[model samples]
Target chain A: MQRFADLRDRKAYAEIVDALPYVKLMGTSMAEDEQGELRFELPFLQPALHGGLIGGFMESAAMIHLMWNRESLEAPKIVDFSLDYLRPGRPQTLFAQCEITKQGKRVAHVLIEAWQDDRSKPVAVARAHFLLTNLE
Target chain B: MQRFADLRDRKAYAEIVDALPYVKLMGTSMAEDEQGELRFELPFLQPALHGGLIGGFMESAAMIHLMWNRESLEAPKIVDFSLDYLRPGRPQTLFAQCEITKQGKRVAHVLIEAWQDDRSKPVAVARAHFLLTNLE
Candidate 1:
């Protein structure tokens, strides 16, 4: 979609909304740090519904989910992720935030944090490293 | 509190994180691997909520809740986790990708994947390594 210009556009936002049905995830928007970071919002039931917000593992997963999309022709291959549970995620609206910490030709690194109701008090945190590659 | 006393326990997810969650992911990262042997990680976001979606990990956490809190505590410690994304989780919810590959006295290896909306299209994938310590 050319730098998501077609997606970042507002006057043509309806198209993106229309495509939501055919797209994956039903996440709400919080914010993003340019193309490096992205945030998604869920509900309290997000944890209760999935399992639990233990150490914010779900939020950590959300970070990886935000890293790439089908449009990225140069997506990275996942290598590994590190998760740290600071507290139990609140069973409210969840806010997931992710940023690219390091970007390599064959590897990309990211950091993610997720919370609920309150953003300051994160339920969990994570760091990820991906091998951005055009492998044989 | 000691397994030597014939303790019976089960893991349970709080009322907050409960949907039909399952094990869809688990594994390890290249960096965290020893001789290509890894742990496990699951990224679940598969569920239905308000015509949308819900939590994936929360569902799996419930199982942990059943195992750790309600089921048994003399199992192991999660050394670490790594997750990958196959697709975007539903906006609000989904299922978990919990996969455990290896289990030993020192650590247990696992691999997992998660998806929502459509099983044919997964949202995320992951792997992790759990360290088990006997506390009898």
Candidate 2:
């Protein structure tokens, strides 16, 4: 598995978001946390529905999934992702964090945690698998 | 369990899409098929990537999920949704259809099928469960 060099750059993440139209619709913004973990936030916008936030949770998860594997710019298609809602997302700023659990030759596993009020209590959790293709 | 009215109206679907901020960002449109299933489409956009489309698939799925539960608009948040990508989404129009499999006193289950290029062969499939709430 290849790790990206500019994963910490917020601008880089923004560029990636621009590529995916869903990023803007979900009102997503990303930055590297102090601990170097990629943190994506979905701000509360008008018509703040709970389902939209849940969709944003998965969108952010997919964003981090692509960012971590920037080396293979042409591969790493999302095969499947599952999200579990722990709490109802309120009309507030929502936060999401994704971590790479395993990277194999052709597939990568990731876990995402989303929260609003407190980090200790997450609003939702997600697991995803990506089909990775290495361009030799 | 409550069934929504006018599930086949394109304009009603558009109104529903407007209520959610993420639907526009994903560049989605919806209409009812001859078979009466709600068909949501994401037109091809530049920088087309697989993850974004997968996210759109879930978003569209959630929209239909909520539309089917319009009887109790007071509540029924998306508890969770899962997607399984079967093929790489190309720079072409992508389609998704959702069906409510099971509905109980406090929960509803839906199945989403997505495809592009060929209708018989689906590119991805998703399952979602919504928390049902009835307000008298």
Candidate 3:
């Protein structure tokens, strides 16, 4: 559990994601992948009004799901988050994973994807930009 | 409250968004603008865990927020959502309004914005695409 522990220790917003009621409401679960990245899994139905997964839920998950090997321990601020809903996420099991493609002194960029059933077929994808601040 | 009543009656998603727990958790409220458009209000705190407002919260609001002035009288599904977080949202009064910029035969496009304090300054803006499904 070293990788997972690393997340618990290194994540900039660990407190926010760890106990936020919304995170729990979304039924978010996380684990360290083989390569040590934080991978999130959701087996619950965070549905919209008519049904299917809510896009915002996945967006929120994607924002935090990128915390695996972040270099800056400073709390990040979301400057911009762009999400693309590729399909109507069904009211079934789903998973989301993100990569911090670019991390810099004042900003970071993350790419996230969500899928259900088949990883090859993604239901949603997003790009997130955050204003980074280093924790002392 | 005639405007609210009309929204309650015309919204294809009144029951769905009204009853969804996530909507309630976000402290979402709705009313009609002078032009009869559905105006959403979110007076919330940006949780430290996620920083700023959760993109999903607004994304979900935008998904159903487009029902203000549609003629189809049918439900819709999200095909994609793109958002730009302009500024850090504070735990204050915030508002969201959406416009259906393009309503096609099979798909519709919407533009959404969220603002706080100053109407001229937006906290975030988004474009959403939805598949139109006529209700019988």
Model 1 chain B, poorest ten-residue lDDT window?
B23-32
* Of candidates 2 and 1, the better by DockQ: 2
How do the residues A64-129 of candidate 3 rate in per-residue lDDT, one tens digit apiece? 554345543544567777766676666677777888787777677888878888768888787777
Interface RMSD of each: 8.2, 2.8, 2.7
The reply for model 1, stretches above 4 Å from the true place, is: A1-5, A9-36, A46-50, A53-71, A117-121, A133-136, B1-80, B83-136
- Sort by DockQ, top down from the best: 2, 3, 1
Report the error of model 1 at residue B50, Å: 24
Candidate 2 clash pair list: none
Expressed as tens digits, the lDDT of each residue in B1-136 for candidate 2 is: 1223543332467666665554655667877679666678877544344444455446556656565535736445677778777876666788878888887777778888888888678878888887766543
Candidate 3 chain B weakest ten by summed lDDT: B46-55
Candidate 2: residue B6 Cα off by (Å) = 9.4
Q: What is the per-residue lDDT of model 2 for residues A1-136, given as tens digits with 9 covering 90 to 100?
A: 1223443343477666665544655667777678756778877544344444465446556655565645646545676778777886677888888887887777778888888889789988888877777654
Off by over 4 Å in 2: A1-19, A45-52, A69-72, B1-11, B45-52, B90-92
Q: Between candidates 1 and 2, which one is better according to TM-score? A: 2
Residue B90, model 1: Cα distance from true site in angstroms: 23
